Design a protein around this ligand. Structure first.
Ligand SMILES: [Zn+2]
Length: 145
């Protein structure tokens, strides 16, 4: 139904649990499999959303949002609605084309602003169960957005 930390470890990271170093191709394979998972499914909860951030640059997140919109999902990964204005190809304010609401626009920006532009490949040991992020990512409550 919805994606969790446990699932990501199993369907994305499982091959790499015993690697002490990753190649550039293996890092790319992780991002692709993670993005793929997050367009087929929505993120179940806050804890998973905070876990994700270690695998996303600000640009990978923007691309996540785009790919989610192409399958008619609200850009904000915790959401299971569509963007409010799904782009019709037979033709021919702006945030409503990417999000269900202004609130999800803001939650999405709030999350993105905190993501790092450090390349995934430069994030030493991010694939490991013992990795420690350089700060805890904050999620904006919808009511405050
Ligand atoms: Zn939404």
């Amino acid at each position: 139904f919805m994606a969790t930390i446990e699932e990501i470890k199993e369907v994305v990271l499982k091959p790499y649990t015993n690697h002490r170093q990753l190649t550039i191709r293996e890092v790319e394979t992780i991002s692709i499999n993670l993005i793929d998972l997050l367009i087929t499914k929505d993120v179940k909860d806050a804890r998973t959303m905070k876990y994700i951030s270690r695998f996303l640059t600000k640009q990978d997140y923007a691309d996540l949002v785009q790919e989610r919109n192409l399958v008619k999902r609200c850009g904000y990964p915790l959401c299971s609605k569509s963007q409010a204005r799904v782009r019709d190809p037979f033709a021919d304010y702006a945030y409503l084309t990417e999000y269900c609401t202004k609130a999800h626009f803001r939650c999405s920006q709030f999350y993105q602003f905190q993501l790092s532009d450090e390349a995934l490949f430069a994030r030493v040991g991010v694939h490991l169960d013992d990795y420690e992020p350089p700060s805890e990512i904050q999620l904006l409550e919808e009511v405050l957005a």
